[PDB]
Symmetry: C2
Subunit: 193 residues, 2 copies
Amino acid sequence: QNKERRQKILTCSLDLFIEKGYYNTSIRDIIALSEVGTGTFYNYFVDKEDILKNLLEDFAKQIISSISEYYLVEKDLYERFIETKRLTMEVFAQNETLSEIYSRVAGSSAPIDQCLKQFEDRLLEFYSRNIEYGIKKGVFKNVPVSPIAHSILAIEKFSLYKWVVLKAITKEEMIEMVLSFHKTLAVGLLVVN
Amino acid sequence: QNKERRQKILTCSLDLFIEKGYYNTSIRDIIALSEVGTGTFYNYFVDKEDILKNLLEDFAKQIISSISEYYLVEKDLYERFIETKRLTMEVFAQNETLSEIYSRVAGSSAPIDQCLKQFEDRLLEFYSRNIEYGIKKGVFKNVPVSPIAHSILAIEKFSLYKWVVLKAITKEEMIEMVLSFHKTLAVGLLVVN
């Protein structure tokens, strides 16, 4: 019941962010469209940034649990390396309107960048754990991990932006690009080493 | 003389974008701070987006010519692969205030995204030509090129943003991350292939 209401406020907030723009949307607009009352709203959120953190927490959680669930059945670490990128790209697509907001508000102001930083740091740490595991199991080379986690995040962010914001590529083209890059990263660009 | 004036308008525009924010800055503010007169201003630019395109054209041009000049002396394609990323990261640092604007206005509106798209497409095409050359010379594997060019651009964009906007890493850490990733991309993440 706390779940329903929390969810109603988040869906309405997302819709208003898409329709009016994140900065042009007020807590007033959200409370009015949510209809939960000013007092109940504050049992959950203090302002817009609290709403954005909560939207992105749920998002990170869905990405990380989809991957972790897949790990229970597929054990080949290379198969995991590729397919987890497709999985992630599909979570983005299931949350299209949020992917859009994520892709539009980066670098806009320090409080919003602080929110995106918590979301991104969480994904980066997870990606690091999984790369570390592969190094330990002799499948991946023992290289610095943080640059690799950042490269995964970066291409995912950039290709999402080109699909959902620029409309310059299709969902399919975005998925293909991302998988192709991870394949090449895995096998290595150099012919000889 | 056309050069001096064009340059004065661009420097002033950059300063106002940093100080007031790109959207809060008007052509009025720029013409007033530039002092070139309303009529002369229009011999060069029709609006802010014309100024942004011109700032980014010069930027792309400086990145591409630094790399092309280096190519006249270093012929090892792997040495080029790494060091060109350091060169690029240094051009970003020499144009810190522009790197900031670039890192802040992405996804903000379709006209500004159209401007960034021309800048990014230009870099992507150049990066593609250089990867293609390496494939043809047997140094790089024959893989799809566009995902690789996008991955180079993406990590460069993302690590620039974390330095100049988030202030979460140092210039040095940004340069190291980017070089480390390109090294791993080159040698390949997998132990065996």
